[PDB]
Structure 1
Amino acid sequence: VNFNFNGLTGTGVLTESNKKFLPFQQFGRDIADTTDAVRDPQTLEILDITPCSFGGVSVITPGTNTSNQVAVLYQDVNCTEVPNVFQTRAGCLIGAEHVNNSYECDIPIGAGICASYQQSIIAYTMSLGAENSVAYSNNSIAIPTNFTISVTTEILPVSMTKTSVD
C-alpha cells in the first residue's frame, strides 16, 4: 500500500510489530535514520513498515545465434510474489527446467546453480569435475610410459588505446 500516517508518507507493506515502544514514541527509525515503524494516530497500535517486495530481473539466455528462448531470474524474490518454476538461493528461476544431472557451468545462476542450453534451457547444480579416486597405498608408484608434449596458448593484454581529451 501507499500510506500517509499523520504526514508520514511512503510505499510499503504494513505488519504487526513486536517493538516495545514507550508511551511517548510515535514512530521509529532504522540505523539508516529512515522511518521504519509508526504508531497509528487513531488506535494506539504499533505497526512495522517495510517496502513492498522487489528485486532485479536477470535474463538467462543462449545467444541469438542459437535460440530466442530465454529464462528470467528474479533475484532474491520468493516464487509466490513473482506474478517451470525453480526455487534456488539466488531466487525464483522461471523458464529453466531443473535437472539433477550436473554439467560444466555455462550460464552461472549463483549459489552453485548454472544454466545451459541443451534442445532447451536447463538449470542444474554444477559439477566440480570428474571424480578420480587415487589408488594410494604405502608401496605403490605410477610412472609414465609414452609421454606427450603439449603447447598451451596464454593471451595477455599489454596496452590500451592512448586517448587524449583536451
Structure 2
Amino acid sequence: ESNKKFLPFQQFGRDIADTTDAVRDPQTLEILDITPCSFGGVSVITPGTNTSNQVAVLYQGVNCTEVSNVFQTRAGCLIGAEYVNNSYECDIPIGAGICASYQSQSIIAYTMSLGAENSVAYSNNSIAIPTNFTISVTTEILPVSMTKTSVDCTMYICGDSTECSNLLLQYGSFCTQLKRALTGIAVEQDKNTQEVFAQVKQIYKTPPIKYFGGFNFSQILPDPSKPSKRSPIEDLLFNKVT
C-alpha cells in the first residue's frame, strides 16, 4: 500500500535512479508501491579438498529469515558453521571480525583474536637493562622485472585473408599505439633490471683462502663445482620457482 501523499493528477512514480516504484490502480483508485524481490550473492567456505568434504554457505546482505544450525552475522547469513566462544587467529576471513576454521571434526565460526595480552610494569624509579644478545637473520623477497611481449595486429585480427586487411585500413592508426606501448614496457623492464643490479663499477674477487675470523660464508658464495656457478641458496630459489 502507498504511504506517500499522491497528488490527484499523476499516474506513475519514480526515484533518484529513475525507476518505477508506484502504479495507479486501473480498476480502483489506489497507488501501489513496488519493491524488488529479495536477491543476493552466495559464497562457499571450504577447507582443502584433500582434508574433508563438507562446506558452509554464506548468503551476502540478507537476513536468515528470507531463505550446524543457521547463524546471522553482520555480513549476512551463515549456514553449516557452528558458533563458539573462544578466539584464535583468523583462518578463513568472512566478514566484520568473523573467521571460520576446521576443527569429531567440523567447521566452527568465531571472532578473531588480535593477540596475547601483556602489561609491562611502570614505576617512577625503575628500569630494565638486557644482559645478553641474539644475532638474527631474516629474508625479504622483491620482484624486479616482468615478461616482455610483442604483438602483430595484421596477423592477429586477420589471418592470411586480404579482405580483412583491406577493411582494417578504415580504422586509421589504432594499431601503432599498441606497438609503442609494448616497446616502452619492454625497454622499461631492462631499465629496471639495470638500475637494480648494476651498482658496482668493478668486478671484485674473493681471496682463495677463506678464513674470515671464524665466520662461515659457504652458503652464500658461488660454488665452483656446479657448472652454473651459483650459491646453494640461489640454486634452491631457482629450483623452487617454476
Pairing partner for 2:8 from 23, 34, 58 = 23
1:65–1:140 distance in 2 versus 1, CA, 3 Å: farther
The structure with higher relative contact order (CA 8 Å, sep 6+) is 1
1:32–1:143 distance in 2 versus 1, CA, 3 Å: same
Comparing 16-25 with 111-120, greater Cα deviation is found at 16-25
Query: Contact 1:19–1:46 at 8 Å: present in 2 too?
Result: no
Q: Please state how far the C-alpha of 1:146 moved relative to its aligned partner.
A: 2.6
* Structure 1 segments (4+ residues) deviating >4 Å: none
1:83–1:127 distance in 2 versus 1, CA, 3 Å: closer
Query: Contact 1:113–1:126 at 8 Å: present in 2 too?
Result: yes
Pairing partner for 1:113 from 95, 98, 123 = 98
Q: Which has the higher helix share?
A: 2
1:130–1:30 distance in 2 versus 1, CA, 3 Å: same
Query: Contact 1:97–1:123 at 8 Å: present in 2 too?
Result: yes
Query: Contact 2:74–2:95 at 8 Å: present in 1 too?
Result: yes
Query: Contact 2:68–2:80 at 8 Å: present in 1 too?
Result: no
Query: Contact 1:27–1:37 at 8 Å: present in 2 too?
Result: yes
Q: Given the two structures, how large is their TM-score scaled by the length of structure 2?
A: 0.57
Question: Which structure 2 segments of 5+ residues have no match?
Answer: 151-240
* Corresponding pairs, count: 151
Q: Please state how far the C-alpha of 1:68 moved relative to its aligned partner.
A: 1.4
Question: Which structure 1 segments of 5+ residues have no match?
Answer: 1-15
1:27–1:144 distance in 2 versus 1, CA, 3 Å: farther
Distance 1:65 1:152 in 2: 32
SS of alignment partner, residue 131 of structure 2: coil
Q: Please state how far the C-alpha of 1:83 moved relative to its aligned partner.
A: 15
Query: Contact 2:43–2:57 at 8 Å: present in 1 too?
Result: yes
Query: Contact 2:98–2:109 at 8 Å: present in 1 too?
Result: yes
1:146–1:33 distance in 2 versus 1, CA, 3 Å: same
Query: Contact 2:11–2:23 at 8 Å: present in 1 too?
Result: yes
Which residue of structure 1 lines up, in the alignment, with residue 47 of structure 2?
62
1:75 lines up with 2:34 in the alignment: no
**Per-residue deviation, residues 13-46 of structure 1 (Å, max 9, x unmatched):** xxx2322211122221121111122222222222
Distance 1:159 1:36 in 2: 54
1:46–1:139 distance in 2 versus 1, CA, 3 Å: farther
Q: Which has the higher strand share?
A: 1
Q: Please state how far the C-alpha of 1:71 moved relative to its aligned partner.
A: 0.4
Task: Name the % identity.
Answer: 97
